[PDB]
Design a protein around this motif. Structure first.
Motif, PDB file in Angstrom:
ATOM      1  N   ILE A 223     -15.088  22.989  13.934  1.00 36.12           N
ATOM      2  CA  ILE A 223     -15.785  22.802  12.666  1.00 36.12           C
ATOM      3  C   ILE A 223     -17.029  23.684  12.646  1.00 36.12           C
ATOM      4  CG2 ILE A 223     -14.938  20.443  12.742  1.00 36.12           C
ATOM      5  CD1 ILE A 223     -18.153  19.799  12.830  1.00 36.12           C
TER       6      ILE A 223
ATOM      7  N   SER B 271      -9.220  19.153   6.915  1.00 31.05           N
ATOM      8  CA  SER B 271      -8.969  20.095   8.003  1.00 31.05           C
ATOM      9  C   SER B 271      -9.858  21.331   7.902  1.00 31.05           C
ATOM     10  CB  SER B 271      -7.492  20.494   8.012  1.00 31.05           C
ATOM     11  N   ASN B 272      -9.846  22.004   6.750  1.00 32.44           N
ATOM     12  CA  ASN B 272     -10.462  23.323   6.638  1.00 32.44           C
ATOM     13  C   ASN B 272     -11.792  23.301   5.897  1.00 32.44           C
TER      14      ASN B 272
ATOM     15  N   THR C 180     -14.036  19.658   6.729  1.00 35.28           N
ATOM     16  CA  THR C 180     -14.356  19.892   8.134  1.00 35.28           C
ATOM     17  C   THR C 180     -14.998  18.682   8.805  1.00 35.28           C
TER      18      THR C 180
END
Lengths: 48, 358, 123, 167
Positions: free
Chosen positions: D56, D81-82, D85
């Motif tokens: 992260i 996930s992206n 974070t």
């Protein structure tokens, strides 16, 4: 009598006149008395 | 040349090299024979050459190149007059990889100055006379050693102007030959350096006469227009006279199996406040994969005209080149289009005539 | 018989005017080559090669620096002598002055020897 | 005062600025003779590859890692996930009654992020009047925070209100 001695190489040095200013015998630096006696001979004695 | 590409069924893999060994047993004589045969084939066909990996170590190359030059000069029989440039490029390419880089740079400079002179010779828009202007100028070789001021008017002076807008070659390109002859002069009486030929020797003689003709024609140009190419150091406004005298002296003393680098050496040992430096000596790196291994990546490469061509900062498209050029792409000029036109296509062996940003 | 400071004062205008002339001839050469390379046959006037002027400027700068350094050395010596020596120029005779000088030199040498012995004993 | 040379050099603005070489470098080579300009091993490699590819944003975890041991941080099912974070769950462990954990889903480092949104606000906070008033006091305290920071400010104010809850 400005002596022009210095080093620019990685393991050596170099000496020369400092009162000619790109003028062998054409003109001078218009200042202190240049070219004292004969320094090239003194250099070449201790050249080796 | 047996050097394949590694694009086999193994995924996204890069190329590879293989040994160009033509068979199991060895045959050095037959091998060098085959090499000379294929090199002559490539020369007469004017194709690219990559027999680098194929040729033996450069020890034999010397014998190879001298035998090749002998065979070319003897059994040309007359196509030499059109294959000289090709064979010189071949010589340069082969001597590049080896040590003998001195003769390499010597060949580059010889080629470029020869091309320049051959282009400048019939480039005179003169008035007609008893004989051709170029043919009449060629006979300058048959002239005295000193006092150019006599022979220059004795041959011809008037019919040399082509146009008023010709004052672009002195400040841009004519400096090349001047700095070159000065570098040749200063480096002559220094045979004591740890190199028998030093930088170069140039004991051909004919090339010296060619450069002498170039100097006399640029002298008549300077008489026709005061903005010629001076020594650029000091006493610019009769050095050219003594320069011509010294070069003619070396010419006569080296034409017919003369001396080399004794009173001549002693007198040329005098260096007036006119010595320039920082000459281009154009050349490019190479692939010195000698015998075992030299692997390169796709990025982060691993260490191993006369209008500049090597400045400090980039200021144009910066067109790259292989032989010596490294010049501008549009050339940023107005009337030098002769050079640009003659170099529009691929340059001398200009397979590496590429471009690069930044 | 010229004093250093007054010489420097009287020489400042020289360095000023030499720098001015230097800039002038530099601009001359610049406009000359700028009209030569791309213009026409207009700039036909042989000026100074700009080497002599620059060398003269550097030489005058060096001479001024030398004079200033000499003056500084002289005044520093006078100051330290006055600060570490009484006024005795014949209420003490010259032999007494020489004796005091020799005694101080010997004391300094003794201090140096003591410090060297201390450094030796340290090792 | 020396203005002629300045404007005269400024005239040569276009691309054809190369003769400066022939005008200056002879004098420079005369006065200075330096062979040491750039002889040392050096090559320009601006960028090759730069990306996290492993975790992260470093700033958030680095800052929250230095908080008090009174809190405990972990991860929910990975729905951030992206971009988000972070999907954190915190349980105040101190000399006070605990409560429902927050959501803690943050935005890029500009931090205009009211990370907790109280997904289970209604029932889990109407369960008891005490914790309901606690939540009300929390919400009234939150709005006064100008550009609050979920990392430190939000959790700090939440803990403060939870400890003041005893009145």
């Amino acid at each position: 009598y400005c002596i022009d001695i210095y080093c620019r190489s990685r393991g050596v040095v170099a000496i020369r006149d400092g009162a000619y200013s790109l003028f062998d015998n054409s003109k001078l630096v218009e200042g202190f008395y240049p070219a004292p006696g004969l320094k090239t001979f003194l250099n070449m004695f201790v050249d080796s | 040349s047996l050097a394949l590409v590694g694009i086999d069924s193994h995924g996204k893999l890069s190329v590879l090299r293989l040994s160009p060994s033509m068979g199991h047993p060895l045959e050095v004589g037959l091998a060098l024979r085959h090499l000379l045969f294929l090199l002559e084939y490539c020369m007469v066909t004017g194709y690219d050459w990559w027999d680098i990996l194929l040729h033996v170590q450069p020890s034999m190359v010397q014998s190879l190149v001298e035998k090749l030059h002998e065979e070319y000069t003897r059994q040309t029989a007359a196509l030499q007059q059109v294959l000289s440039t090709r064979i010189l490029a071949m010589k340069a390419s082969l001597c590049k990889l080896s040590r003998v880089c001195d003769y390499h740079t010597k060949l580059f400079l010889i080629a470029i100055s020869s091309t320049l002179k051959s282009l400048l010779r019939p480039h005179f828009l003169n008035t007609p006379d008893k004989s051709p202007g170029d043919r009449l100028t060629e006979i300058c070789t048959k002239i005295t050693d000193v006092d150019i001021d006599k022979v220059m008017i004795n041959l011809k002076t008037e019919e040399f102007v082509l146009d008023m807008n010709t004052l672009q070659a002195l400040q841009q390109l004519l400096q090349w030959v001047g700095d070159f002859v000065l570098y040749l002069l200063a480096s002559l009486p220094n045979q004591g350096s740890l190199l028998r030929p030093g930088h170069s020797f140039l004991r051909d003689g004919t090339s010296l006469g060619m450069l002498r003709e170039l100097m006399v024609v640029i002298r008549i140009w300077g008489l026709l227009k005061p903005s010629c190419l001076p020594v650029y150091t000091a006493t610019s406004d009769d050095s050219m006279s003594l320069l011509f005298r010294l070069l003619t002296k070396l010419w006569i003393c080296c034409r017919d199996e003369g001396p080399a680098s004794p009173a001549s050496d002693g007198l040329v040992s005098r260096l007036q406040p006119k010595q320039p430096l920082r000459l281009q000596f154009g050349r490019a790196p190479t692939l010195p994969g000698s015998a075992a291994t030299l692997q390169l990546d796709g990025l982060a490469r691993a260490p191993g005209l006369h209008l500049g061509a090597c400045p400090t900062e980039e200021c144009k498209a910066c067109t790259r080149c292989g032989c010596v050029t490294m010049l501008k792409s549009p050339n940023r000029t107005t009337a030098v289009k002769q050079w640009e036109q003659r170099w529009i296509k691929n340059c001398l062996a200009v397979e590496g005539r590429g471009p690069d940003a930044c | 018989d010229f004093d250093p400071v007054q010489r420097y004062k009287m020489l400042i205008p020289q360095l000023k005017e030499s720098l001015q002339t230097l800039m002038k001839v530099a601009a001359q050469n610049l406009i000359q080559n700028t009209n030569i390379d791309n213009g026409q046959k207009s700039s036909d006037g042989p000026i100074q090669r700009f080497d002599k002027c620059l060398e003269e400027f550097y030489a005058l700068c060096d001479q001024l620096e030398l004079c200033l350094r000499l003056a500084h050395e002289c005044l520093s010596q006078s100051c330290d002598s006055a600060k570490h020596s009484p006024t005795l120029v014949p209420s003490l005779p010259y032999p007494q002055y020489l004796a005091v000088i020799k005694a101080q030199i010997s004391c300094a040498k003794d201090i140096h020897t003591a410090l060297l012995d201390c450094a030796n004993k340290v090792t | 005062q020396p203005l002629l040379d300045a404007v005269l050099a400024n005239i040569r603005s276009p691309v054809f600025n190369h003769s400066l070489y022939r005008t200056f470098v002879p004098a420079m080579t005369a006065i200075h003779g330096p062979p040491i300009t750039a002889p040392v091993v050096c090559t320009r490699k601006r960028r090759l590859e730069d990306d996290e590819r492993q975790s992260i944003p470093s700033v958030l975890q680095g800052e929250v890692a230095r908080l008090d041991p009174k809190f405990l941080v972990n991860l929910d099912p990975s729905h951030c996930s992206n971009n988000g974070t972070v999907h954190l769950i915190c349980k105040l462990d101190d000399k006070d009654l605990p409560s429902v954990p927050p959501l803690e889903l943050s935005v890029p480092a500009d931090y205009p992020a009211q990370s907790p949104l109280w997904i289970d606000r209604q029932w889990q906070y109407d369960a008891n009047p005490f914790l309901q008033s606690v939540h009300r006091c929390m919400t009234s305290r939150l709005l006064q925070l100008p550009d609050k920071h979920s990392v430190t400010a939000l959790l700090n104010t939440w803990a403060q209100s939870v400890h003041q809850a005893c009145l």
